Amino acid sequence: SEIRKDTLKAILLELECHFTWNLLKEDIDLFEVEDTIGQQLEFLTTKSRLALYNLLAYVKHLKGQNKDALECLEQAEEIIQQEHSDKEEVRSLVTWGNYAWVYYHMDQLEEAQKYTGKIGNVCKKLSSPSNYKLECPETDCEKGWALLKFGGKYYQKAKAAFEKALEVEPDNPEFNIGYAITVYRLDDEGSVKSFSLGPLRKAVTLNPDNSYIKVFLALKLQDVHAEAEGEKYIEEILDQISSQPYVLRYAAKFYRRKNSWNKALELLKKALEVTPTSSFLHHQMGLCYRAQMIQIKKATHNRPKGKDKLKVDELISSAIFHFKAAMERDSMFAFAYTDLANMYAEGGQYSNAEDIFRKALRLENITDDHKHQIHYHYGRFQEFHRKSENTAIHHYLEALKVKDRSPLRTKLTSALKKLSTKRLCHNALDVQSLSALGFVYKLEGEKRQAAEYYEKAQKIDPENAEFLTALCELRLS
Numbered sequence: 001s002e003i004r005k006d007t008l009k010a011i012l013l014e015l016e017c018h019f020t021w022n023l024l025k026e027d028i029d030l031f032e033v034e035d036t037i038g039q040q041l042e043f044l045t046t047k048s049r050l051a052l053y054n055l056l057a058y059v060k061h062l063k064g065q066n067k068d069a070l071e072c073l074e075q076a077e078e079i080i081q082q083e084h085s086d087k088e089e090v091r092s093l094v095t096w097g098n099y100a101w102v103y104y105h106m107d108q109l110e111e112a113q114k115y116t117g118k119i120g121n122v123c124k125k126l127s128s129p130s131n132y133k134l135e136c137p138e139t140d141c142e143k144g145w146a147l148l149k150f151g152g153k154y155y156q157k158a159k160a161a162f163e164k165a166l167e168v169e170p171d172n173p174e175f176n177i178g179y180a181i182t183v184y185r186l187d188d189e190g191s192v193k194s195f196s197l198g199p200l201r202k203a204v205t206l207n208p209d210n211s212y213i214k215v216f217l218a219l220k221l222q223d224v225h226a227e228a229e230g231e232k233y234i235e236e237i238l239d240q241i242s243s244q245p246y247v248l249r250y251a252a253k254f255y256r257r258k259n260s261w262n263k264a265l266e267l268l269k270k271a272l273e274v275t276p277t278s279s280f281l282h283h284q285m286g287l288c289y290r291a292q293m294i295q296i297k298k299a300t301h302n303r304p305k306g307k308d309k310l311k312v313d314e315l316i317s318s319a320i321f322h323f324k325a326a327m328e329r330d331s332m333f334a335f336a337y338t339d340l341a342n343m344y345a346e347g348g349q350y351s352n353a354e355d356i357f358r359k360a361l362r363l364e365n366i367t368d369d370h371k372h373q374i375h376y377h378y379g380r381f382q383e384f385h386r387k388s389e390n391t392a393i394h395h396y397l398e399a400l401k402v403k404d405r406s407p408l409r410t411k412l413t414s415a416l417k418k419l420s421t422k423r424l425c426h427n428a429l430d431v432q433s434l435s436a437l438g439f440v441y442k443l444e445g446e447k448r449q450a451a452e453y454y455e456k457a458q459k460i461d462p463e464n465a466e467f468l469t470a471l472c473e474l475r476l477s
Contacts, residue, residue: 004109005104005109008104008109008112008113008116009104011116011132012097012100012101012104012112012116014130014131014132014133015097015100015101015116015119015132015133016093016094016097016133016134016139016143017054017093017094017096017097017098017100017101018054018055018057018058018094018097018098018101018146019058019097019098019101020097021143021146021147023058023146023147023150023154024150025062026367026368027150027151027153027154027367028149028150028151028367029330029332029333029334029366029367029370030059030062030063031063031279031330031332031333032279032280032330032332032333033059033149033150034056034059034060034063035275035277035278035279035280035330036149036246036280037052037055037056037059037149038056038275039245039246039271039274039275039278040052040246041053041056042243042244042245042246042274042275043243043244043274045211045212045241045244045246045247046212047174047210048145048174049079050076050079050080050091050095050142051141051142051145051146053072053073053075053076053079054072054073054076054094054095054098054142055145055146055149056072057069057070057072057073057076057098057102058098058146060072061101061102061105066102066105066106069098069102070099070102073095073098073099073102076095076098077092077095080092080095089122089125090122090126090134090136091138092118092122093119093122093133093134093136093139094139094142096115096118096119097115097119099112099115100112100113100115100116100119103115116132119132119133120132122134137164137165137167137168137169137172137175138165140161140162140164140165141161141162141165141174141175141178143161144158144161144162144165144175144178144179144182145158145178147161148178148181148182148185151369152185152369155182155185155186156186158178158182158185159179159182159183159186162175162178162179162182163179165178166179171206172206173203173206173207173210176199176202176203176206176207177203177206177207177210177212177213179199179203180196180199180200180202180203180213180216181203181213181216183195183196183199183200184196184200184216184219184220187220187223192223194220194223194224196216196220197220197221197224200213200216200217200220201217203217204217204233211237211240211241211244211247212246212247214233214236214237215233215234215237215241215247215250215251215254216250217230217233218230218231218233218234218251218254219250219253219254221233222254222257222258227258230254231254231258234251234254234255237251238251242270243270243274244274245270245271245272245274245275245278245281248267248268248270248271249267249268249271249280249281249284251267252264252265252267252268252271252284252288253284255267256287256288256291259291259292259295261288261289261291261292264288265285265288265289268281268284268285268288269285272285277329278329279325279326279327279329279330279333279336280326280333282322282323282325282326282329282336283322283323283326283333283335283336283339285318285322286318286319286320286321286322286323286326286336286339286340287339289315289316289318289319289322290315290319290339290343292315293311293312293315293316293319296308296311296312296315297312316343316347319343320340320343323336323339323340323343324336324340327340331363332363332365332366334360334363334366334370334373334374335370335373337356337357337359337360337363337374338357338360338373338374338377340356341353341354341356341357341360341377341381342377342381344356345381345385350385350386353381353385357374357377357378357381360374360378361374361375361378368402368403369403369406371402371403372399372402372403372406372408373399373408375395375396375398375399375402376395376396376399376408376411376412378395379391379392379393379394379395379396379399379415380392382395383415383419389419389422389423390423390432392415392419393416393419393420393423393432393433393436394432396412396415396416396419396436397416397436397439399412400412400413400416400439400440400443404443413440413443413444416436416437416439416440417437417440419433419436420433420434420436420437420440421433421437424437429460431457431460431461434453434454434456434457434460435453435454435457435466435467435470437449437453438450438451438452438453438454438457438467438470439470441453442454442470442473442474447474447477450470450474451471451474451475454467454470454471454474455471458471
């Protein structure tokens with residue numbers, strides 16, 4: 001019955017939970033997010049298993065695994081009850097909201113209504129101004145963490161949620177970690193900012209035994225050239241994090257940026273032992289082997305000999321090994337494809353690089369951010385290794401069409417201008433170059449120039465709908 005489904009949905013949309021926080025599937029890699037959450041659940045890396053299971057349940061649903069989502073929600077409930085709180089009904093509202101939505105998506109309307117009913121009863125008892133929700137700092141915090149996990153498009157929204165929570169309890173240890181991590185994420189080659197330094201120090205003060213927050217402080221301290229103070233925090237946590245793969249990968253980053261490669265690898269290996277299925281961790285190892293090789297090549301002016309040549313060959317093979325192991329564990333782990341392809345290209349293995357790039361260019365269910373970077377890297381490969389300028393222009397353009405504002409924007413528009421201008425010097429009637437320039441100048445706001453270029457392209461190709469559309473938009477002035 002579409003009638004009954006829609007009246008229930010009116011109610012489900014009034015709940016506060018993951019299904020009403022606008023957390024879009026298209027903005028994440030579900031397998032990577034699922035891996036990340038799993039790693040955070042390991043060996044009490046967090047004091048917040050409840051939020052993690054609620055989020056994991058939402059992610060399972062997004063992967064089309066509603067039965068597994070129910071299992072996470074059952075684990076969520078057990079964490080609530082086992083706590084024997086006088087506030088177990090209020091603490092249960094997000095978990096109940098997720099239950100209602102999941103049962104709704106499984107076409108179990110009667111079950112969904114049991115949960116909306118329970119949510120309604122609590123809100124009524126507590127005299128909430130809303131029928132189906134109850135304002136609470138804790139829920140703001142949980143929303144904060146969910147937003148944070150969905151990535152860069154949500155960082156400002158996450159910051160707002162944590163600030164809402166902090167408004168009620170400014171010295172809450174948990175809200176402060178969430179706030180400080182968000183500002184850390186917003187601080188992020190830049191140049192790197194240090195707006196997070198204050199909030200991170202505060203969060204560490206409020207959470208003296210927390211390895212998770214300490215490692216971010218160490219990283220930030222490293223960023224502002226206080227590596228020595230940062231290493232003291234790293235040394236403080238090392239014994240506590242030996243079975244905590246999520247924190248280990250950040251401590252390993254700390255050592256990698258110091259060029260302490262064996263230290264970084266020792267930690268990443270500990271991490272892979274807790275979670276051997278992690279694409280993320282394999283890729284991090286590959287980056288670490290690659291960084292070492294680049295450093296050796298520099299120190300030997302690109303001509304390594306002897307034990308250095310030997311080391312370089314081993315590092316290259318080890319890097320390839322881990323990039324492939326990453327791809328094997330998540331066919332959607334796009335960073336592994338491009339880093340692998342770029343390595344083959346650098347070693348002159350063009351067929352191999354092309355094989356990898358073609359797989360990457362055909363991945364469908366990956367974020368626009370990843371497609372954008374894949375197009376960029378393929379464009380660079382075409383420009384500098386194939387020397388195929390038209391093919392490069394095609395992919396630089398696709399990169400911009402997928403994502404027009406990113407740290408790659410300046411590089412993309414500069415390359416498009418250069419190759420298009422060069423081409424137009426040879427053939428004033430090259431349609432691809434004319435329209436590339438029209439696209440770039442429109443994107444930059446140079447509307448007269450953009451119209452001039454598109455008008456030339458259209459006169460040569462009169463029925464091209466893209467040129468007609470771009471021109472219609474420009475004529476709006």
